[PDB]
C-alpha cells in the first residue's frame, strides 16, 4: 500500500485534510513486528529508529550526448543520531574536526494542561471501601461510626488506613498514563538515536550502528535532578498526625516543586527491573549523562565519493553524546518512595549505604529513624552510578518491561496513541540547514545585488577524498555557537539553552524560553494501580504494536519524520525562508516575524486536526523570538528564496505525495510566443537597457487550483550541483527577475546536502563499517554532479502580499518556454525492502516455528 | 472627484539587507484602451 | 499565569513581547 | 511443565547452574516456555500467574 | 534478465549456518536453483537460470 495506492496519489485542493488523512494512513503502515526484538535486537532497533525511504534518481539534458544517471537507487534518511563534542578533559583550544565545543539543550517544561483522566473500574477491595463510605450509619457513640466526629475527619477506624487514604479516588475512579508513556518513548529514542546515523555538525561523520555499550557520567551543574526519600509503609504513616498520611498528593502543574509527591509500591514490585525506570521517566531529567563507551569503533568519516574512513583523525579527544544529553525535562523535584509490606530490617537491594526510613540502619540496627534525602537518581541504585559501563540491552530491558506492564495492565489504546503523537514532536534533532547559492549571470551583473555564488552552513571534515567546493565552513568558536543555535526540532523550533564541558569546568546555560512542555504524570494513579484498588484494563488495547515499546517507538519516529516533512511543506506554502531559523533570525530583515505569523497558523491547524493536544506544548515561537545572535558571524550574501526544508525532497514526497517525475521536464521547440512575457528596463533618458524574455512564476493560488504547476516549477528552476566548481549550468541561461527587489536580478538558492551525506544513501540500511561499499561501481556521474534534493524556489518573497516575478533569459539565446538547457534532476518514490529487512521477515513469518503460534493458537 | 471597494495594490520594494524600503499602497493608471471604452476614466485620472 | 503562585520560576513577562 | 518444555523445545541445560553463561538459547526458550506456563495457570488455577 | 525491485520476499529462502555453540554464523538470503524436472515441465526456467 506504500506505493500503488499512496505513491500514485498526489496532493488535493483542500491540502490540510489531504495531508492529515495521508499521515494517518502511513502511520497504519508503520509496522516493525513485535516478535523481532527477541531473536535480533540490533536489527529491530535499526528498522524501528532509522527508517529508509527508497527513491530513484535521474538527470536529463537536452543536447548532451553524455550518458548521465537515469534510474539510480538511493535511501534517504533524516536526523542526528547522536552528537560529537570535544571530550570533558580537553585543555587545548585548537579546533577539532567534527567536535563541537558545546551542545544544545532542548529544555522541556511542565505543561499547564492535564491529561484528561478516563474512567476506571474499582477492584473488589476498592468496591468494598466505596460501599462502606456510601453506607448509612446512625453515628451514635456506641460504635466507631462516631469517630469521624469525636476523633477527626481523617480517621481510619471505619475504612482502614487504605480506604481512608484512597477515599477521594474511589469515590471517582479515573486515571491517565500518557505522560509516563511519552517519557518512555523519548528515553528509548534518545538513548538509541533516531535518524540517518549522522552524529556531528560535519555532515560527513556517521555513527556506525546502534551503540552496544554506554557509559554514565554525573555532572552537578548540568544535571536536572530529583530528590528522593525512602520509607517503609509503617514509617511513612508514622510521620503524620494520628498516622493517616494525606489522601491526595498531585500538585498544581505550575508548582510541581512546591510539595513532595509520593509513590506507593508493594514489596513484590520493588525488585522488578522496571522499578528504577519507574522512578526515572516521572522525575526531572536528565539526572545523568550517557555517552558511547568508545567513539573510535562506532564512528566513521565518509568521503565525497563514498570512501569510509573508520578511525577519524581526532577520536581520542572526542565524546559521543547520545540525544539523551541534549534534552532537559521538568518533572517532580521531591518524591517519596514508600515500600509497602516490609519488616523493620528491610534492606535497600540497590545501592549500598542507602538506608530506608524504618528499615535497617547504618550500624546494623533495625527501624532506621532518619528519612535521608538523596539528590539525584544516581545516589540510589548503582546501575546509574558515575563512570559505570553498561550494555544498552540491559539498560533498556527495564524500559521495555515498564512499557509492556503499563500498557497491558493500566493504560488504554487512546493513551498510547496520544503518547506516540506527542512524543513524535521531540523524537528527532536536525542540524542547521545548509544552503548554496548559484549567483547570477555576468550579463545581468549591473541588475543584481547577489552576483557572486555563496553557501551557508556547509561543513564537512573528510580529508581522504576531494572536498566539495560548496563546503567552506570553518569551525571556529563563533561559527560553532551559531550553528548550534540553528539546530531545530521536527516542527522547526530551535533552542536557546546549551551546555559546555571542556577543560575541567562543567557549565550549563538554561533560558526561560522553552522548546515545549509535557504534562505531569499523576503519581496517585500509579499508587492506586500498584496497590490494586483499580481493576486492570487488560482487554482494552485493540491495536497490536501497542504492547511493544519498540513498535510504538517506530510509530513515533515515523510520525516525527512526517511532522518534519509536513512542516517543510507548510513553510514552503507559507513562504518561510530558511534564514528565519538561523542564529541571527531576529536581527536580519523583519520578514522573520511576519513569516512566523503564517507558519504558526499552519502548524496550529495541523496540531489541532491531527494530534489533539494543546498546541503550545508542542510548538511555540518563544525560542524563535528569543534568539541571542552571535556577533562575530556575518551572514552570507544570499537572497531569501528557499524554504525551511530539513528533510530531503524524496522524504517530503513520501509524506505529501508530491510528484517530481521526468514527465514534467519540457522539450518544446517554440514558434509562437505563447506564455512569454517581455521584461523591459529603461533609464531616465528613455533608452532601453535590458529587453529580455521571461516566463512568469506560478502563484500559490495557481498551484492550489492545479498542483502539477508545482511539479513543473521544480523542473524549470532546478539544476544539479557541481562538485569541483561553483558554476552551475542554470546561470548560463536563466535568472530570477523580482520587481520587488531594488536590483531585480537574482540567482537560485537550493538547500544543500553534500556528497558525503548523499553517499550514506547508497546503502539500504544505516550501517557503515568499512566493509560496506558506498561508491556506485558502474556510474561515475556522482564524481562531478551532486543530486539536488532541495525544495524549489519559494513562489513568494513576501509572506503577506503577492507580486509576480519571472524566470528570465540571461543570454538572449535560450527561450524560457523551450525548456531547461541544464541538467534537470527528476525523482520518484520506490517501495523496496532491504536485504536485512527481508531476512528478518523470513525469520518471524516463514521460519518461525516457536511452540506458541503453533500450539497456543486457539 | 472621489470623496468617500478594493481595487488598489500594495507595492513592496526591498534592498540588499532584506529590509523593506517602500511598503506603500498604489493604484494603476488607466490604459488608453480603458479610456477608449470608458471616457469618464480620463476625467477621473 | 493561571494560578496565583509567584516565587521564582513563574514567567510573568508579556507573551511574545 | 515437562510436556510444555518439550513442545516449546526448551533444552535441559537452560535450567543448570550456568544457564546464563552458556548459550543465548536460554532467554528465547524462557520467553517461549513462560507463555505455555501462564496460559495453563490462567486456564486451570485461576490465581494470578 | 530480471530487473525487479522486490518488496515482498516471494521466492526467497533463508540460508542459516550455526556453530556447535548455537550461534548463527552466516544468515544469508538465497534463491533455489531449478531442478531438472522443473525445466522439463517449463523450459523457460533454463533460460532464466
CA torsion angle for A22, A23, A25, A29 (degrees, to 10)? 130
State the Cα–Cα distance between residues A304 and A320, nearest whole angstrom: 23
What is the DSSP pairing of strand A72-75 with strand A435-437?
A: unpaired
Query: How far apart are the C-alpha atoms of A797 and A456, rounded to whole Å?
Result: 19
B8, B13, B16, best to mutate vs chain A, most A CBs in 10 Å = B16
Give the distance from residue D23's alpha carbon to the nearest chain E alpha carbon, in angstroms: 7
Contacts of D25 in chain E (CB under 8 A): 22
Which grid coordinates are listed for A690? Answer: 535590458
Q: Assign 3-class secondary structure to A159-218.
A: CHHHHHHCHHHHHCCEECCHHHHHHHHHHHHHHHCCCCCECCCCCCEEECCCCCEEEEEC
Task: Verify whether the Cβ–Cβ distance A625 to C17 is below 8 Å.
Answer: yes
CB atoms under 10 Å from CB of A373, counted, come to 12
The CA distance from A554 to the nearest CA of chain E, in Å, is 19
Neighbours of chain B (3+ CB pairs under 8 A): A
**Subunit partners of chain D (3 or more CB pairs within 8 A):** A, E
How many residues does this entry show for chain B?
45
Angle at A53 between CA A188 and CA A518, to 5 degrees: 35
Rounded Cα distance between A70 and A633, Å, is 41
- CA–CA separation, A659 and A829 (whole Å): 9
Which of A640, A743, A803 lies closest to B18 in CB terms? A640
Q: Does the distance separating the beta carbons of C16 and A622 come in below 8 Å?
A: yes
Concatenate the DSSP letters of all residues of A236-259 into one string: HHTTSTTS---S--PPPTT-TTSS
Whether A741 and B13 lie within 8 Å, measured CB to CB: yes
Asked if B20 and A743 come within 8 Å (Cβ–Cβ), the reply is no
Q: Give the nearest chain E residue to D22 (CA atoms).
A: E21
Q: Which residues of C touch A512 (CB under 8 A)?
A: 11, 13
Assess contact for A832 and E9: CB atoms under 8 A: no
Query: Which residues of chain B make contact with A589, given a CB cutoff of 8 A?
Result: 14, 17-20
CA distance A117 to chain C (A): 20
* Sign of the dihedral defined by the CA atoms of residues A235, A241, A246, A252, in that order: negative
d(CA A394, CA A383): 10
DSSP characters over A67-123: ---SSEEEE---SBSSEEEE-TT----S-BTTBBSEEEEEEEEE-SS-PPPEE-PBP
The DSSP result for B1-45, as a single string, is --------EEE--B-TTS-BS--EEE-PPPPHHHHHH-THHHHH-
Whole-angstrom Cα distance, residue A272 to residue A292?
26
| Of residues E6, E13, E28, nearest to A832 (C-beta) | E6
CA-CA distance, A591 to A597, in Å (whole number)?
10
Residues of D in contact with A38 (CB under 8 A): 28, 31
Query: DSSP string spanning A418-454?
Result: HHHHHHHTTS--BPPPPEEE----GGGGGGBS--S-E
Among all chains, which residue has been given the C-alpha cell 507558519? A599
Contact A167, A247 (CB under 8 A): yes
* Helix (H) or strand (E) segment spanning residue A733: none
A852 with D36: Cβ contact below 8 A: yes
Chain E positions in Cβ-Cβ contact with residue A832 (cut-off 8 Å): 5-7
- Nearest Cα to A617, choosing from A490, A496, A518, A494? A518
Q: Which residues of D touch E21 (CB under 8 A)?
A: 23
Q: Chain C residue with minimal CA distance to A624?
A: C16
Q: Which residues contact A107 (CB under 8 A, 6 or more apart)?
A: A327, A328, A330, A495, A497, A510, A511, A514, A515
Which residues, 6 or more positions from A648, have their beta carbon under 8 angstroms from its beta carbon?
A76, A78, A753, A789
**A255 to C17: CB separation less than 8 angstroms, yes or no:** no
Chain D: give the shortest CA distance to residue E19, in Å. Answer: 11
Q: How far apart are alpha carbons E16 and A566 in whole angstroms?
A: 42
Q: Are strands E28-30 and E13-15 parallel, antiparallel or unpaired?
A: antiparallel
Experimental approach was cryo-EM
Instruction: Name the nearest CA neighbour of A754 among A4, A279, A205, A140.
Output: A205
- The C-alpha cell of A210 is what? 546502534
Instruction: Decide if A256 contacts A302 (C-beta within 8 A).
Output: no
- Residue C16 to chain A, least CA–CA distance (Å): 7
Q: Which three cell numbers stand for residue A287?
A: 539526572
Q: Which of D3, D5, D8, D40 to mutate to test the interface with A (most CBs of A within 10 A)?
A: D8
CB contact under 8 A, A838 and E27: no
Please report residues of A whose CB lies closer than 8 A to that of E29. 835, 838-839, 842
Grouping H, G, I as helix, E, B as strand and the rest as coil, residue D40 is helix
What residues contact residue A689 under an 8 Å CB cut-off, 6+ apart? A681, A682, A683
In this complex, do A833 and E7 lie within 8 Å of one another by their Cβ atoms?
Answer: yes
Closest residue, chain E, to A833 (C-alpha): E7
CB contact under 8 A, A839 and E7: no
For cell 538515536, what's the residue?
A193
Please give the residue of chain D at the shortest CA–CA distance from E19: D23
Question: Are A713 and A700 contacting, i.e. CB atoms less than 8 angstroms apart?
Answer: no
CA nearest to A169, candidates A115, A116, A129, A136: A129
Do A335 and A283 form a contact (C-beta atoms < 8 A)? yes
Q: What is the DSSP string of chain E?
A: -------S-TT-EEE--B-TTS-BS--EEE-PPPPHHHHHH-THHHHH-
Residue found by looking up cell 529491530 in the block: A44
> Across the interface, do C16 and A625 touch by the CB < 8 Å criterion?
yes
Interface of chain D against chain E, CB under 8 Å?
23-25
- The A-side interface with E (CB below 8 A) comprises 830-833, 835, 838-839, 841-843, 846-847
3-state secondary structure at position A524: helix
**CB neighbour class for A350 (10 Å; exposed up to 12, middle 13-18, buried from 19):** middle
Interchain contact E/C (3 or more Cβ pairs less than 8 Å): no
Total count of residues recorded for chain A: 858
Q: Look at C1 and A622 and tell me if their CB atoms are within 8 Å.
A: no
Query: A791 with A572: CB under 8 angstroms?
Result: yes
Tell me how close the Cα of B20 comes to any Cα of chain A, in angstroms: 8
**Interface test mutation site (partner E, options D24, D26, D28, max chain E beta carbons within 10 A):** D24
How far apart CA A829 and CA A7 sit, in angstroms, is: 7
Angle (deg, nearest 10), helices A178-192 and A392-409 = 160
**CA–CA distance, A477 with A483 (Å, rounded to integer):** 10
Resolution in Å equals 2.1
Using a CB-CB cut-off of 8 Å, the residues of chain B touching A642 are none
CA distances from A732 to A155, A439, A679, A726, A783 (A): 89, 10, 18, 12, 22
Q: Among A842, A845, A846, which would you mutate to test the E interface (most chain E Cβ atoms within 10 Å of its Cβ)?
A: A842
Compute the distance between CA of residue A115 and CA of residue A643 in angstroms, rounded to an integer. Answer: 35
Q: How many CB atoms lie within 10 A of CB A286?
A: 24
Indicate the pairing of strand A102-110 with strand A327-329: parallel
Residue closest to A606 by CA, chosen among A571, A575, A567: A567
- CB contacts of A38 in chain E (<8 Å) are none
Amino acid at each position: 500500500k506504500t506505493l500503488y495506492n499512496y505513491y500514485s496519489e498526489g496532493p488535493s485542493t483542500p491540502i490540510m485534510p489531504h495531508l492529515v488523512n495521508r499521515l494517518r494512513g502511513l502511520d497504519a503502515l508503520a509496522k516493525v513486528d513485535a516478535t523481532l526484538s527477541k531473536v535480533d535486537m540490533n536489527a529491530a532497533y535499526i528498522f524501528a529508529l532509522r527508517p529508509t525511504f527508497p527513491y530513484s534518481y535521474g538527470y536529463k539534458q537536452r543536447f548532451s550526448n553524455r550518458r548521465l544517471t537515469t534510474s539510480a537507487l538511493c535511501y534517504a534518511r533524516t536526523g542526528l543520531s547522536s552528537f560529537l563534542t570535544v571530550d570533558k578533559t580537553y585543555t587545548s583550544n585548537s579546533p577539532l574536526k567534527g567536535g563541537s565545543r558545546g551542545w544544545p539543550i532542548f529544555n522541556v517544561g511542565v505543561s499547564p494542561h492535564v491529561a484528561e483522566p478516563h474512567m476506571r473500574t474499582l477492584s473488589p477491595i476498592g468496591l468494598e471501601v466505596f460501599n462502606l463510605a456510601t453506607s448509612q450509619f446512625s453515628k451514635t457513640l456506641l460504635t466507631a461510626s462516631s469517630k469521624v466526629f469525636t476523633q477527626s475527619l481523617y480517621t481510619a477506624d471505619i475504612l482502614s488506613i487504605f480506604g481512608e487514604v484512597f477515599l477521594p479516588h474511589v469515590m471517582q475512579p479515573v486515571s491517565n498514563y500518557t505522560p509516563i508513556l511519552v517519557r518512555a518513548l523519548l528515553a528509548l529514542i534518545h538513548i538509541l538515536g533516531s535518524g540517518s546515523g549522522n552524529c556531528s555538525l560535519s555532515s560527513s561523520i556517521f555513527e556506525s550502528s546502534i551503540p552496544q555499550f554506554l557509559t554514565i557520567s554525573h555532572s552537578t551543574n548540568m544535571s536536572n535532578r530529583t530528590r528522593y526519600c525512602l520509607h517503609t509503609w509503617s514509617a511513612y504513616k508514622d510521620m503524620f498526625r494520628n498516622g493517616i498520611p494525606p489522601q491526595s498528593t498531585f500538585p498544581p502543574t505550575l508548582a510541581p516543586e512546591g510539595s513532595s509527591a509520593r509513590i506507593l509500591i508493594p514489596a513484590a514490585l520493588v525488585t522488578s527491573p522496571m522499578f528504577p525506570w519507574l522512578l526515572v521517566l516521572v522525575s526531572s531529567g536528565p539526572q545523568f549523562f550517557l555517552y558511547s563507551k568508545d567513539a573510535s569503533i562506532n564512528t566513521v568519516d565518509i568521503g565525497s565519493r563514498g570512501r569510509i574512513t573508520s578511525p577519524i583523525p581526532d577520536v581520542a579527544h572526542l565524546d559521543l553524546h547520545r540525544l539523551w544529553n541534549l534534552f532537559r525535562f521538568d518533572g517532580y523535584r521531591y518524591i517519596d518512595v514508600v515500600i509497602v509490606g516490609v519488616d523493620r530490617d528491610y534492606v535497600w537491594p540497590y545501592q549500598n549505604g542507602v538506608y530506608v526510613h524504618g528499615g535497617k540502619g547504618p550500624k546494623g540496627t533495625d527501624n532506621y529513624e532518619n528519612a535521608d534525602v538523596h539528590d539525584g537518581i544516581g545516589t540510589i541504585f548503582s546501575s546509574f552510578n558515575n563512570n559505570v559501563n553498561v550494555q544498552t540491552s540491559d539498560l533498556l530491558l527495564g524500559l521495555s518491561t515498564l512499557w509492556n506492564h503499563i500498557t497491558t495492565t493500566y493504560a488504554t489504546e487512546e493513551e498510547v496513541t496520544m503518547a506516540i503523537k506527542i512524543a513524535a514532536a521531540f523524537a528527532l534533532v536536525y542540524p542547521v540547514q545548509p544552503i548554496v547559492y548559484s549567483g547570477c549571470s555576468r550579463a545581468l551583473y549591473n541588475h543584481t545585488s547577489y552576483f557572486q555564488p555563496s553557501s551557508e552552513n556547509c561543513y564537512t571534515t573528510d580529508t581522504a577524498e576531494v572536498k566539495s567546493t560548496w563546503d567552506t565552513v570553518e569551525l571556529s568558536v563563533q561559527v560553532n555557537n551559531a550553528m548550534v543555535l540553528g539546530m531545530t526540532l521536527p516542527f522547526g523550533q530551535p533552542t536557546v539553552s546549551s551546555a559546555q564541558w571542556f577543560n575541567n569546568i562543567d557549565k550549563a546555560e538554561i533560558s526561560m524560553f522553552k522548546v515545549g512542555n509535557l504534562p505531569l504524570q499523576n503519581l496517585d494513579y500509579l499508587s492506586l494501580d500498584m496497590m490494586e484498588f483499580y481493576a486492570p484494563t487488560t482487554g482494552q488495547l485493540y491495536d497490536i504494536r501497542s504492547d511493544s515499546l519498540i513498535s510504538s517507538a517506530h510509530r513515533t519516529v515515523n510520525l516525527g519524520i512526517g511532522y518534519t516533512a509536513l512542516a517543510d511543506f507548510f513553510a514552503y506554502l507559507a513562504s518561510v525562508p530558511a534564514q528565519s531559523f538561523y542564529h541571527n533570525r531576529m536581527v536580519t530583515s523583519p520578514i522573520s516575524k511576519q513569516a512566523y505569523s503564517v507558519y504558526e497558523r499552519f502548524i496550529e491547524r495541523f496540531i489541532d486536526d491531527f494530534v489533539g493536544w494543546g498546541r503550545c506544548d508542542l510548538f511555540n515561537l518563544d525560542t524563535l523570538l528569543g534568539a541571542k545572535r552571535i556577533a562575530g558571524v556575518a551572514s552570507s550574501p544570499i537572497p531569501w528564496h528557499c524554504s525551511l526544508q530539513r528533510c530531503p525532497l524524496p522524504i517530503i514526497m513520501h509524506y505529501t505525495g508530491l510528484h517530481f517525475g521526468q514527465e514534467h521536464i519540457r522539450v518544446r521547440d517554440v514558434a509562437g510566443v505563447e506564455g512569454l512575457q517581455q521584461i523591459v528596463l529603461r533609464n531616465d533618458q528613455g533608452s532601453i537597457v535590458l529587453d529580455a524574455l521571461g516566463t512568469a512564476a506560478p502563484s500559490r493560488l495557481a498551484v492550489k487550483l492545479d498542483w502539477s504547476r508545482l511539479s513543473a516549477w521544480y523542473s524549470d528552476t532546478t539544476c544539479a550541483i557541481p562538485i569541483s566548481d561553483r558554476v552551475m549550468e542554470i546561470v548560463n541561461y536563466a535568472a530570477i527577475w523580482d520587481p520587488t527587489q531594488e536590483r531585480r536580478a537574482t540567482g537560485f538558492v537550493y538547500t544543500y546536502f553534500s556528497p558525503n551525506f548523499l553517499s550514506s544513501f547508497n546503502v539500504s540500511e544505516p550501517i557503515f563499517n568499512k566493509t560496506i561499499n558506498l561508491t556506485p561501481p558502474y556510474d561515475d556521474t556522482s564524481q562531478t554532479v551532486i543530486q539536488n534534493l532541495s525544495m524549489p524556489q519559494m513562489l513568494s518573497f513576501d509572506p503577506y502580499y503577492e507580486s509576480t516575478f519571472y524566470v528570465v533569459s540571461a543570454d538572449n539565446e535560450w527561450v524560457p518556454t523551450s525548456g531547461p538547457a541544464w541538467k534537470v534532476p527528476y525523482l520518484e518514490n520506490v517501495v523496496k525492502r532491504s536485504g536485512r529487512r527481508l531476512l528478518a521477515e523470513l525469520r518471524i513469518a516463514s521460519n518461525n516455528g516457536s511452540g506458541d503460534r503453533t500450539f497456543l493458537d486457539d
